[PDB]
């Protein structure tokens, strides 16, 4: 049996590492494991009955140093309302806006949101929107194990309350939020150190009900191909 299929079984929960940045400064980090996904809110007030795990972004500061911009940050957090919903349905991650803050997203690197390609689009409000497809990710991951392509991107960056910072430093934006499906961080890491020969390495898939995985490089590449053949493609 393929242990990597555990990611795509219904009822299983991925871990989402949420990291928030106010003006190029990390202010918040929390890991969420919820079946109905997460929900980036700013605590006003609110509808407690809304599905998804509430992730409250912290209030900024009331400092004489940095207040001409922290009032703007607090202004954005006051308009998140229902917040930014992010959940998983099968092999897709879905994001939707429930508040009044226009939000732009992109699947980029972990230490840098804006590479140059621009945003992958804006988080929709009236409909749910696909932000990540596991299909193309595994395919690119196999090619990465096959010493050819580059490392596939898995980090979801969100630019809240402002337009996407293209050709501008991302430290200028008021509210930036990085969300990482920690299973994908592991899969990439497993392919980063594991590709030494046919030895064993250990990968924690970081998902609900799962044990560590001691696999060989060939075994890992075999499971990945078997994972692909059992997924929808476009």
């Amino acid at each position: 049996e393929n242990p990597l299929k555990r990611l795509l079984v219904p009822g299983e929960e991925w871990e989402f590492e949420v990291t928030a940045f106010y003006r190029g400064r990390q202010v918040f980090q929390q890991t969420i494991s919820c079946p109905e996904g997460l929900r980036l809110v700013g605590s006003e007030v609110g509808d407690r009955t809304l599905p998804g795990w509430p992730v409250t972004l912290p209030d900024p500061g009331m400092s004489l140093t940095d207040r001409g911009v922290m009032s703007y940050v607090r202004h954005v957090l006051s308009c998140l309302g229902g917040g930014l919903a992010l959940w998983r349905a099968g092999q897709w991650l879905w994001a939707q806006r429930l508040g009044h803050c226009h939000t732009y997203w992109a699947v980029s690197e972990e230490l840098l949101p804006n590479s140059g390609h621009g945003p992958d689009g804006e988080v929709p409000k009236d409909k749910e929107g696909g932000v990540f497809d596991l299909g193309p990710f595994i395919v690119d991951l196999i090619t990465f194990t096959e010493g050819s392509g580059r490392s596939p991107r898995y980090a979801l960056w969100f630019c809240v309350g402002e337009s996407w910072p293209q050709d501008q430093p991302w430290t200028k934006r008021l509210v930036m939020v990085k969300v990482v499906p920690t299973c994908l961080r592991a899969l990439v890491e497993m392919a980063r150190v594991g590709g030494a020969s046919s030895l064993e390495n250990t990968v924690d898939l970081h998902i609900s009900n799962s044990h560590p995985l001691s696999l060989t490089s060939d075994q890992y590449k075999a499971y990945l191909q078997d994972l692909v053949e059992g997924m929808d493609f476009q």
């Binding site: 911009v69 703007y72 202004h75 009044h100 803050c101 226009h102 402002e162 337009s163």
Partner: peptide, 10 residues
């Protein structure tokens, strides 16, 4: 440093 808040109300 000016800020255009894409906050859509009403």
């Amino acid at each position: 440093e000016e800020f255009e808040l894409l906050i859509s109300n009403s």
